[PDB]
């Protein structure tokens, strides 16, 4: 809401959304905030500008030329001409709901900017252009120089809007006539909604088990007038609405169905139909094979359904108990399931009120939808080895080999009576894989079947909308990709496959991690602070290294253990890593460098110090100070430029040392009031500080073994071990080295004063 897009800080076109046409907004505080921001930022003398740094109708830019060259330093600053359309929107916005004095003020302001033409009638000019001669004065005194009209002015849009506003203000028409749908009451709060939940038994054994513990339900039978089927049938049925053969129309394309669609009842040819929620589907992914996962998705869906429910009538949810919800012995339901049902009872579960009962009572009070469009108008040796051999590992290996070699769809002829295809055998493998709960090959066979998780694109767009840049693949580049814009489902899948290469399981792991990140972003959007770019491969490497350290095993053993880990355990590990909760300080520095958790104001301080020097060179590469006028601190390109400059070194410890030295240099620059006028090399600062620390430690009397040397960086590991603050921390040494370097390039005078 506050920003029109990721590139424009503010746009005056947001007024139309939050005014007379198409009222779609909530949290009126946001309305007031955006109105005040627009008034403070874009208001001028005879109107307002669309957005900052627009060069339309300017004495520069060479108007006969398009495709603006990247030379917008100051040639389009504070000279945006004007647009009275946002002014003429304000009078209507004020006169609509309850404002009168604002209406008179805006009308008085607008009458002064009017131009009288033929026959003496109001006429609204398009824009007022700055004179080509008085341009330097405006740069020092903005909104002070008079302007002249420029361009066409038969503006039908603004004139019609002004005429409509004047007619409405005259009192001839009421606000209730323009909108008969009553769209002016979108700011009225809705108190709450009660959710209804129905419980069914899959067979008689399940019903007996639930009645053992005191839960009374009815089986799938005994409700013959009512039928239940999954939601994919509902989607396939909906894929026939609005189809025409003469006009070449194929109807609605196939798409997934949310909880908001399955909650309501349906009527198909004088019958009652109910559809179960999508997240209890086991033929798509293995996410529904975990009970705690089912519980948390159920709680989230319950909260979401109770939140909006902008429909009429109470909702209805059906949660049948399947065979997979029992224990290992199959004689009782799991503890989590019985706890969830008991919490559903007594009318409080998750964050909503839950009322249970039977479908007979819920029929008289529930939303019903009437559908009318549905009315009638030697490989043989390998096969033998597969048949005779045992163990899931060998079976999976031989199936994968045969699928890659000759059997994408070829019949293995394993059964002389039934033609058993490779895909057929792979599918029936899931049946025995699910019973053992062996999370070591289910991912492998899922990679063979190339199963794709539904609703990935919405998760990706949700992650992108938070001003974050996503990344797929392991380093280094060009193999690293950068998805900066939303992509189609097929394009995203193929990009993921190309980034994943032939490792196969990497694609499934990346999809899983993306799902976890999307799920956790909504609930707690505060743990992603101090991070700008998300890289999946670095994350997986971090988890592998952490597991290897925890188990004190080899990398292969750590990867095998990570693959075996349950999805809930993977979520817990991801949460632990994200929360952040010799060998102690070095590990912290390595983790921080791997996740490059920069402070919240690093870029602003970098820009501020850059404003008082010619640049900051790192290992030959230099960042010129001329970039300060070509960009702004809020712009993403500056941030990615500094990140690209910083990540030249591969060692995370070096990156952290660089960050600390830059921060201490920015702090120290405040005390002095002078211009260095020279290139500052931070590696020299780090080396000088390390040498000073080495000399001090040698003076103290430490033996050589304590003051060791790194194999490929030249920095003592005890320096990495040193705490930041304190009288013996690295901060003091870095400050001393920075002061020495500054003195080395100073005109024999510091004149420090604060």
């Amino acid at each position: 809401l506050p920003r029109a897009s990721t590139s424009k800080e503010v746009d005056a076109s947001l007024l139309s959304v939050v005014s007379f046409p198409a009222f779609a907004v909530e949290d009126s505080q946001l309305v007031e905030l955006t109105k005040q921001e627009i008034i403070t930022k874009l208001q001028g003398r005879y109107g307002c500008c669309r957005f900052l740094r627009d060069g339309y109708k300017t004495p520069k830019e060479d108007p006969n030329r398009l495709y603006y060259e990247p030379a917008e330093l100051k040639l389009f600053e504070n000279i945006e001409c004007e647009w009275p359309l946002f002014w003429t929107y304000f009078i209507l916005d004020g006169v609509f709901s309850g404002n009168a004095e604002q209406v008179q003020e805006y009308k008085e302001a607008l009458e002064a900017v009017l131009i009288k033409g033929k026959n003496g009638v109001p006429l609204l000019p398009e824009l007022y252009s700055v004179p080509p001669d008085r341009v330097d004065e405006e740069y020092q005194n903005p909104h002070t120089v008079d302007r002249v009209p420029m361009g066409k002015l038969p503006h039908m849009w603004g004139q019609s809007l002004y005429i409509l506003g004047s007619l409405m203000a005259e009192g001839f028409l009421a606000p209730g006539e323009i909108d008969p749908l009553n769209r002016r009451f979108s700011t009225v709060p809705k108190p709450d909604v009660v959710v209804q939940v129905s419980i069914l038994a899959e067979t008689e054994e399940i019903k007996t088990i639930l009645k053992d513990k005191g839960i009374y339900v009815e089986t799938i039978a005994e409700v013959y007038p009512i039928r239940v089927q999954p939601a994919r049938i509902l989607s396939h049925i909906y894929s026939s609405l609005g189809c025409n053969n003469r006009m070449k129309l194929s109807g609605r394309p196939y798409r997934h169905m949310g909880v908001l669609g399955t909650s309501k009842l349906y009527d198909i040819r004088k019958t009652i139909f109910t559809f179960t929620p999508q997240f209890i589907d086991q033929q798509q992914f293995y996410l529904a094979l975990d009970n705690k996962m089912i519980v948390e998705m159920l709680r989230t869906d319950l909260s979401y359904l109770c939140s909006r429910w902008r429909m009429t009538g109470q909702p209805t949810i059906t949660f049948p108990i399947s065979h997979s919800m029992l224990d290992e012995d199959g004689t009782s339901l799991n503890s989590s399931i019985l706890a969830a049902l008991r919490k559903m009872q007594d009318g409080y579960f998750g964050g909503a009120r839950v009322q249970t009962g039977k479908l007979s009572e819920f029929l008289t009070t529930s939303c019903c939808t009437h559908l009318s469009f549905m009315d009638p108008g030697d490989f043989k040796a390998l096969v033998l080895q597969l048949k005779e051999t045992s163990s899931l590992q060998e079976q999976a290996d031989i199936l994968y080999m045969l699928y890659t070699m000759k059997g994408p769809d070829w019949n293995t002829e394993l059964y002389n009576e039934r033609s058993a295809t490779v895909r057929e055998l792979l599918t029936e493998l899931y049946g025995k894989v699910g019973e053992i709960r062996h999370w070591g090959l289910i991912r492998y066979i899922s990679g063979i079947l190339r199963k794709k998780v539904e609703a990935l694109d919405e998760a990706c767009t949700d992650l992108l909308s938070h001003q974050k840049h996503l990344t797929v693949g392991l380093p280094p580049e060009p193999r690293e990709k950068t998805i900066s814009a939303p992509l189609p489902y097929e394009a995203l899948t193929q990009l993921i496959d190309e980034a994943s290469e032939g490792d196969m399981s990497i694609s499934i792991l990346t999809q899983e991690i993306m799902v976890y990140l999307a799920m956790y972003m909504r609930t707690q959007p505060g743990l992603f602070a101090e991070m700008f770019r998300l890289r999946i491969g670095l994350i997986i490497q971090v988890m592998a290294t952490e597991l290897a350290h925890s188990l004190r095993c080899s990398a292969e053993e750590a990867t095998e253990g990570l693959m075996n880990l349950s999805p809930s355990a993977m979520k817990n590990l991801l949460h632990h890593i994200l929360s952040g909760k010799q060998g102690q300080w070095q590990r912290r520095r390595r983790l921080d460098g791997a996740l490059n958790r920069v402070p919240v104001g690093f870029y602003q301080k970098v820009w501020k110090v850059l404003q008082k020097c010619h640049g900051l060179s790192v290992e030959g590469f230099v960042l010129p100070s001329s970039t300060t006028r070509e960009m702004t601190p809020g712009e993403i390109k500056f941030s990615v430029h500094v990140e690209s400059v910083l990540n030249r070194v591969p060692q995370p410890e070096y990156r952290q040392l660089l960050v600390e030295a830059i921060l201490v240099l920015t702090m120290l620059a405040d005390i002095e009031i002078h211009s260095i006028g020279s290139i500052i090399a931070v590696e020299k600062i780090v080396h000088i500080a390390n040498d000073l620390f080495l000399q001090e430690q040698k003076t103290l009397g430490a033996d050589d073994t304590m003051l060791a040397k790194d194999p490929a960086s030249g920095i003592c590991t005890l320096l990495y071990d040193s705490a930041p603050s304190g009288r013996f921390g690295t901060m003091t040494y870095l400050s001393k080295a920075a002061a020495t370097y500054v003195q080395e390039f100073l005109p024999h005078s510091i004149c420090a004063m604060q």
Binding site: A339, Y348, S725
Partner: protein, 376 residues
């Protein structure tokens, strides 16, 4: 212990405000008058993972809590339990919605505090502890994380979960709390069973240790290993750093030293602590009658102060950039800036528990071969 429907139709839930081990804090509004409150939803069932014995002990503990908060209600500096509701699965305790977080966030953000707010905070704490001791009620859980802050810098104690009544003539022999905040008596009682027990002296020790961590910024006693930490807690050799306590008055140091005393009998009480000159203040008085020697003394001290203020003013030293190159930790602003920046960079690694603490960031020891000698 009213029925749940009254709570359902009386208070309306809202967004989360905090999370805990097994409970979450959620804001609620009282429909008749639209006043805001904070509720504590406790799941006695514990998501179905609790054995019935654990469930029953949780209900008993919650009930004894509720009945111990009932009696203490009335003090303006204590939590007010507005309403309670009980079900077979949940407890709903309605409290006042304060505004901000605990003292932990304030201390982390401001690194160290000054004496101006410290005086008021510890005056309020001494008043509350004196009131509690008068009511023959002990708390034994005095922690910075158990104090909430208002918009007007108002603090009220909470988390009485470990509080219990003490019959006269009785001596408790139980061990609880984080290892940093035990007074020596609990440690001795844990090690040997022949000691009679402890009393309100543990509250005084907690007050002293929170004094020290509020002033210095780091706990007086902390070390990566537990058994040694217990050892030099037992020996009791708290020390003040050289370039850390060179800008503080002697009265506050004396009060702190009086607060922590190994002998339980010699420890200062709430009234004796409140009688200290550190809290001394005057409003108006005209009954000062005395001998001329005192008049000479007062005029002499007046002249002395009037001539000493100028000399104290002139004692300031310039920026001395050369000393900055030599040693920047000597200057107070430089040390403050370094500490603030270090806290800002690594402020996401300080949480509850003995594993991570504020003292882990500062390193005042001359790291050298002397680190070889750790213990026996």
């Amino acid at each position: 212990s009213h029925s749940a429907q009254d709570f359902y139709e009386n208070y309306e839930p809202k967004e989360i405000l905090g999370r805990g081990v097994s409970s979450v804090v959620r804001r609620c509004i009282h429909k008749p008058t639209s006043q805001e409150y904070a509720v504590k939803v406790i799941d006695v069932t514990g998501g179905g993972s609790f054995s019935p014995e654990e469930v029953r002990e949780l209900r008993e503990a919650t009930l004894k809590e509720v009945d111990i908060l009932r009696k203490v209600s009335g003090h303006p500096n204590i939590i007010q339990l507005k309403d309670t509701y009980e079900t077979n699965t949940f407890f709903f305790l309605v409290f006042d919605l304060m505004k901000r977080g605990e003292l932990f966030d304030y201390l982390t953000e401001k690194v160290t505090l000054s004496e101006k707010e410290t005086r008021k905070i510890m005056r309020a704490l001494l008043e509350v502890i004196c009131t509690l001791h008068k009511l023959n009620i002990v708390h034994r859980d005095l922690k910075p994380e158990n104090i909430l802050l208002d918009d007007n810098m108002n603090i009220k104690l909470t988390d009485f979960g470990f509080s219990c009544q003490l019959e006269p003539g009785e001596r408790l022999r139980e061990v609880c709390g984080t290892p940093s905040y035990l007074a020596p008596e609990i440690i001795e009682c844990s090690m040997n069973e022949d000691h009679p027990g402890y009393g309100k002296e543990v509250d005084m020790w907690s007050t002293g240790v929170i004094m020290y961590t509020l002033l210095a910024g780091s706990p007086p006693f902390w070390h990566r290993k537990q058994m040694l930490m217990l050892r030099m807690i037992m020996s009791g050799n708290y020390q003040f750093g050289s370039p850390e306590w060179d800008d503080y008055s002697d009265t506050v140091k004396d009060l702190v030293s009086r607060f922590l005393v190994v002998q339980p009998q010699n420890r200062y009480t709430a009234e004796e602590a409140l009688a200290h000159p550190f809290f001394q203040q005057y409003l108006v008085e005209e009954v000062r009658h005395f001998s001329p020697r005192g008049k000479f003394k007062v005029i002499a001290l007046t002249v002395l102060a009037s001539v000493r203020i100028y000399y104290q003013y002139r004692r300031v030293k310039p920026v001395t950039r050369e000393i900055v190159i030599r040693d920047p930790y000597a200057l107070r602003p430089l040390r403050r800036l370094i500490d603030a920046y270090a806290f800002r960079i690594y402020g996401h690694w300080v949480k509850k528990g003995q594993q991570q603490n504020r003292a882990a960031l500062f390193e005042n020891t001359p790291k050298a071969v002397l680190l070889s000698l750790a213990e026996e």
